[model samples]
Target: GKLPVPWPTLVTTLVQCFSRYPDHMKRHDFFKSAMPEGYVQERTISFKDDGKYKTRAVVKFEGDTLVNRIELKGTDFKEDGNILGHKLEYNFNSHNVYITADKQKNGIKANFTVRHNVEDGSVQLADHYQQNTPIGDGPVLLPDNHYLSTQTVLSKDPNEKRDHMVLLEFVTAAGITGSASQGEELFTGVVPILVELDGDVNGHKFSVRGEGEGDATIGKLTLKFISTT
Candidate 1:
């Protein structure tokens, strides 16, 4: 009750008060951690950003430090293995991971009892505790329990337009966030890549979802001139 932010204290305190968890659970499968063992990168389905309809993001590792950096438009975060000032432990053999904070003052301040997604990869803000951020950079966009912002971009080709079309894309989303919805009400980007196509063909508007290139067009062609009179 005294400043620009009371959150800092709350974070540190969370490390002190419990033995890691109150049976808290995270449903997300993809979490920021090390490259899964034998887990090939970009070998095939390398993307594991944690969600299907995820936000646009770019990840980077700090040079030679084993630190990870992630950006999700307007936010920034770092993960280097600590719960504020505490350390989280990982049992690699069992593939078991949890935050630890049993000791205090000078060494391991928050031997927590929560689960983690890594064996060793420098944790910061405790990866699991803050996994629900809407963007990869760490801003609480979703509840630590379930759901945040969702942008499922679905598009199509005119079976015919694919012939007329060269490229297709839209700065769209799942509209699942409940933020982007029905007819031109969008949130961040410009209205382009023609996510939605409302045009008249032979005087008609049509719509269908074909799913990439086509995540890429074809829209609702409203054929109005050919009156149904």
Candidate 2:
């Protein structure tokens, strides 16, 4: 049937179509099914020394599915503060998902940050940013369905809040197109903030909160957004 259009373009278009309908689960399921078979994988590696190491993997789904990219990262650190000995330790886990096709050429990107305070048995989880952008084409390739599913579940029940909070930032002509297709673009190096809630609690919602830092920052500052859901 000639497929009617380029597979990438078709997938992009379908993702855009899903955007018009914000039915969450519906859109989620559609995206899940559209993913290509054996198109995802996960890689986990731990560093032996006190140094820091991070690992990430991505997979691409061709055709009218449009899910272009997904990334996950985990980091662990151990530091000594003179007299503090080997007490200060930090571990961070994060997941980022991006959808590139939409009306204004704007797509969505979400990030989740989880921090563990081993000494105190306390955990701090934050939904950093849900930045929206007209840059970048469709979704980025993701590692695997399990990773996606894990992210979905985390996003939904982040910190036990049932709400999802995401913020997006836009840049001029910031978008990514496979090959050079005239007006093709990529997202600015800025990172947006996204967050989610863990259901309602004590009349106050429990939420995962955080913000984009470094290359993920927008404008002259890295703002933080917090909420329950």
Candidate 3:
């Protein structure tokens, strides 16, 4: 099975399931690893900044569709928190597509939901901590994965009042290592891009400033085969 779908299309589709958009981001998908249905892949990524955080993400396929893209995170997350776990299901039989995340820290019990209707680009969001109010009105939600973030803007159409225009993007500083394993084989590599967040939802100006240094760790991804049975 030479990859159930194009690598770019696969990644884009996963994001689409989260954002509920039928379009792909403006970028190239260079990682061309291939596998088939029942061929599972697993990755463990760790992040530390005084507080320790780790994630184990599992990806699987069913024919051309991605299913059960589950991930578990944290044992000592944030040095002040306990755990956060989430799951992504694409083309679900009863629910279509969705991402469900649950968080538990100290005495707090929080969760978030990103759901889609039968319409391809319609989305509904609900966050327990945010008074259960939907975040964005369109086909977009905050990223379910730690490595990704989203910027939502106001649509150009004057008649469109819902701030559903969402963009998921990031820039990488070259020379990072990315790898994957198929059976017993392994591969690794890197790249960078600049990201800026600026917009107004109702003529109110605002901007997001991000600053950081390149760490030897962080950007590397290692995916390996877990099972075929």
Clashing pairs counted in every model = 33, 47, 5
Over 4 Å off, model 1: 1-142, 148-156, 159-190, 193-229
Question: Which 10 consecutive residues of model 3 have the lowest summed lDDT?
Answer: 126-135
Residue 39, candidate 3: alpha-carbon lDDT: 21
Name the better of 1 and 3 by TM-score.
Answer: 3
- Tens-place lDDT digits, model 1, residues 1-229: 1111111111111101001111122112122211111011110101122111111222222331111112111112122212222233322111122222212211111111222223256422222222111112221111122222111212223453221212221211111122211111111222111112112212222322111111111221111111111
Model 2 agreement with the true structure over 1-229: per-residue lDDT tens digits: 1111111111110111112111222223222222332122222322233222122223232332223232333234333411113231222232333332222322333333323233456332322333233323435322111112111111222463332323222111111222121111111233232222122211322233434421211222232333323
Worst 10 residues of 2 by lDDT: 5-14
lDDT of 3 by residue, 126-158 (tens): 111111111122221222312122322111235
Q: How far out, in Å, is residue 227 in model 3?
A: 28
Please give the distance, in angstroms, between residue 154's alpha carbon in candidate 1 and its true position after superposition: 7.5
TM-score, ranked from best to worst: 2, 3, 1
What lDDT score goes with residue 226 in model 2?
38
Which parts of model 3 have CA positions greater than 4 angstroms off? 1-31, 38-45, 78-167, 170-229
TM-scores for candidates 1 onward, in order: 0.16, 0.24, 0.23
**Model 3 steric clash pairs:** 19-139, 171-193, 172-192, 172-193, 178-189
